XYZ file of C-alpha atoms in Angstrom:
152
model
C 243.025 245.857 -0.111
C 244.052 243.222 -2.201
C 242.403 239.795 -3.722
C 243.065 237.315 -5.915
C 241.166 234.245 -7.663
C 237.344 233.991 -6.783
C 236.604 236.018 -9.707
C 234.767 232.905 -11.162
C 235.358 233.378 -15.315
C 235.539 229.989 -16.426
C 231.874 227.960 -17.020
C 231.331 224.719 -15.954
C 230.007 222.625 -18.996
C 226.708 224.635 -19.320
C 223.871 222.502 -20.657
C 222.303 219.261 -20.255
C 224.554 216.082 -20.678
C 223.734 212.086 -20.110
C 223.860 208.657 -22.124
C 223.031 208.449 -25.865
C 220.447 206.044 -27.153
C 220.600 203.506 -24.435
C 218.162 201.980 -26.494
C 219.829 199.178 -28.830
C 223.869 199.586 -29.386
C 225.225 196.184 -28.890
C 223.069 192.743 -28.895
C 219.811 194.156 -27.427
C 217.546 193.704 -30.216
C 216.709 194.074 -33.971
C 215.111 197.296 -35.530
C 215.635 200.738 -33.964
C 212.331 201.824 -33.505
C 209.295 200.213 -35.513
C 209.073 199.722 -39.110
C 210.956 196.454 -40.711
C 211.480 198.398 -43.544
C 213.709 200.978 -41.592
C 216.590 198.980 -42.092
C 216.408 198.574 -45.688
C 215.734 202.490 -45.898
C 219.045 202.539 -43.783
C 221.241 200.823 -46.755
C 219.573 203.032 -49.307
C 220.103 206.154 -47.110
C 223.331 204.757 -46.328
C 226.657 203.044 -47.908
C 225.462 200.233 -46.676
C 223.735 198.581 -49.882
C 222.026 199.570 -53.094
C 218.427 200.360 -53.130
C 217.952 196.858 -54.862
C 220.174 195.010 -51.948
C 218.156 196.865 -49.069
C 214.943 196.209 -50.624
C 215.902 192.936 -51.170
C 216.699 192.331 -47.467
C 213.174 194.205 -46.842
C 211.559 191.907 -48.651
C 213.639 188.779 -48.011
C 212.548 189.485 -44.071
C 209.142 189.764 -45.566
C 209.636 186.518 -47.226
C 210.500 184.931 -43.376
C 207.606 186.597 -42.074
C 205.593 185.015 -45.089
C 207.001 181.912 -44.114
C 205.377 182.378 -40.570
C 201.585 182.310 -40.159
C 201.397 185.416 -38.456
C 199.185 188.118 -40.096
C 199.633 191.342 -37.945
C 202.967 191.485 -40.267
C 200.903 190.709 -43.375
C 199.573 194.189 -43.587
C 202.714 195.500 -41.991
C 204.322 193.310 -44.900
C 201.924 195.242 -47.361
C 203.386 198.477 -45.264
C 207.063 197.313 -46.101
C 205.949 197.532 -49.449
C 204.718 200.804 -49.379
C 208.383 201.544 -47.593
C 210.213 200.942 -50.365
C 207.349 201.822 -52.753
C 207.696 205.532 -52.155
C 211.659 205.236 -51.766
C 211.998 204.066 -55.132
C 210.054 206.975 -56.635
C 212.618 209.004 -54.951
C 215.508 206.813 -55.476
C 214.768 206.408 -59.032
C 214.296 202.715 -59.167
C 211.596 201.770 -61.590
C 213.014 197.885 -62.244
C 213.055 197.297 -58.807
C 209.239 198.159 -58.645
C 208.244 195.613 -60.832
C 210.679 193.307 -59.249
C 209.723 193.319 -56.018
C 206.037 193.003 -57.084
C 206.777 190.614 -59.673
C 208.849 188.566 -57.175
C 206.771 188.805 -54.299
C 203.627 187.704 -55.940
C 205.606 184.867 -57.758
C 206.564 183.701 -54.387
C 202.886 183.654 -53.257
C 202.105 181.668 -56.148
C 204.698 179.088 -55.507
C 203.647 179.248 -52.117
C 200.417 180.171 -50.055
C 200.058 183.531 -48.371
C 197.184 184.355 -50.705
C 195.874 186.455 -48.166
C 198.734 188.792 -48.091
C 197.877 188.816 -51.839
C 194.316 189.718 -50.887
C 195.328 192.574 -48.651
C 197.443 193.462 -51.891
C 194.349 193.500 -54.137
C 192.605 195.418 -51.401
C 195.547 197.916 -51.325
C 196.357 198.079 -55.064
C 199.804 196.458 -54.630
C 200.169 195.068 -57.725
C 202.011 195.790 -61.578
C 203.518 199.393 -62.089
C 200.900 201.787 -60.280
C 201.515 204.472 -63.016
C 202.332 202.500 -66.092
C 205.663 200.611 -66.032
C 207.461 203.978 -65.857
C 209.473 205.471 -63.370
C 207.899 209.047 -63.509
C 203.966 209.272 -64.539
C 200.807 210.923 -63.355
C 198.779 207.836 -63.223
C 197.811 206.587 -59.499
C 197.245 203.393 -57.865
C 194.361 202.735 -60.241
C 196.318 200.247 -62.771
C 197.092 198.367 -59.903
C 193.679 198.602 -58.414
C 192.810 196.977 -61.962
C 195.168 194.197 -61.587
C 193.615 192.872 -58.594
C 190.795 194.877 -57.874
C 188.144 194.071 -54.757
C 185.055 194.721 -56.943
C 183.691 194.353 -60.378
C 183.700 190.932 -61.619
């Protein structure tokens, strides 16, 4: 007539559970998932580095690549440029723009990598696309003018 326990009141865990990440924690490799610019993005989005030091390491890494002879990274370089490009607009960094641009270019000048400069002309990756500003209505046109793949 009497019974104790076996009532089942406490739930066991309740939900999925396993290892986290398991991708790259310790050494493993560099870069989380694609995009070599994501790192710079990390510092700009984190307390790591300022939008300048971060973008600096981004272009710097791009310099290492630009040191190599591989181009899979040259269009991807343009992409990195595209990485801090948009971020800067949201990060309010105008000087950093003409800086990475005049710096990466002045660099292509000192050395070769004119091919990188080529896609730059084909991508409008030169001068302050808007108008040496931080908030305008102008588009890539300006850049398209600095180095256009058409006209004379």
